[PDB]
């Protein structure tokens, strides 16, 4: 029944995209589909098995100027990128080249998910990247530098029910842009809404994973400089 909902909302996205129609129903449909796939690999398989990926490429292409539409689409894809079993699905050139471009989007609400997709796909290692090896390395440093250009969002862009997705990213020491995205993302949601996340970031093991970054011999100065900024609010949250 929830897969029916996903299929039906996907149907609305298909409909609105065929008619190239940016409107509150499409924007709400993406948001809905973004939520239904959160922390839901099962609802992510359906998005994928129901051609969501190719449909969302169509949305990204159809509405290259629609930053809200891009954010919600990428939001969903950020959720697919959290599922390892769905890695080879996003290993699609035309998709990554587009994501890779939205990585440099000025909209921070857009590039954040672009980066988070990228970060999750890079985080899977050298082997899992079935796309151009040169591009993955171009992304590796483009992902890093894109984050450094980012502004503080005006408000909370994304909501998280857990930080566990970010935890395996904290250990990508060979790929600091991946770690940079993770720590920036926690730095964002925590600082934006510390009454939500700060307790939970501790309660899931964030302290140690963040301490294994600050007090880590070889760590990118920026990745550490964010883990410092997070731990200051975390340690302030403890006392």
């Amino acid at each position: 029944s929830e897969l029916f909902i996903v299929r039906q909302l996907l149907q609305i996205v298909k409909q609105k995209t065929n008619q190239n129609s940016v409107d509150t129903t499409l924007k709400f449909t993406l948001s809905a589909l973004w939520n239904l796939t959160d922390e839901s690999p099962t609802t992510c398989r359906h998005f994928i098995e129901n051609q969501g990926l190719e449909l969302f490429m169509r949305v990204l292409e159809s509405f290259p100027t629609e930053s809200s539409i891009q954010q919600k689409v990428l939001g969903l894809l950020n959720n697919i990128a959290e599922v390892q079993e769905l890695h080879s699905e996003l290993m699609w050139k035309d998709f990554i080249d587009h994501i890779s471009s939205l990585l440099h989007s000025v909209e921070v609400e857009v590039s954040y998910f672009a980066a988070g997709i990228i970060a999750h796909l890079i985080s899977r290692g050298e082997q899992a990247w079935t796309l151009s090896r040169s591009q993955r390395n171009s992304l590796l440093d483009d992902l890093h530098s894109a984050i450094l250009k980012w502004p503080t969002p005006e408000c909370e862009m994304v909501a998280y029910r857990s930080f566990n997705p970010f935890f395996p990213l904290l250990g990508c020491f060979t790929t600091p842009g991946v770690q940079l995205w993770a720590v920036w993302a926690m730095q964002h949601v925590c600082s934006k809404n510390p009454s939500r996340y700060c307790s939970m970031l501790i309660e899931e093991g964030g302290l140690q994973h963040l301490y294994n970054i600050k007090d880590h011999e070889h760590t990118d100065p920026h990745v550490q400089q964010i883990a410092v900024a997070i731990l200051d609010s975390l340690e302030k949250h403890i006392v």
Partner: peptide
């Protein structure tokens, strides 16, 4: 993960 916007 989740969208901040409700409904």
């Amino acid at each position: 993960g989740y969208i901040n916007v409700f409904a």
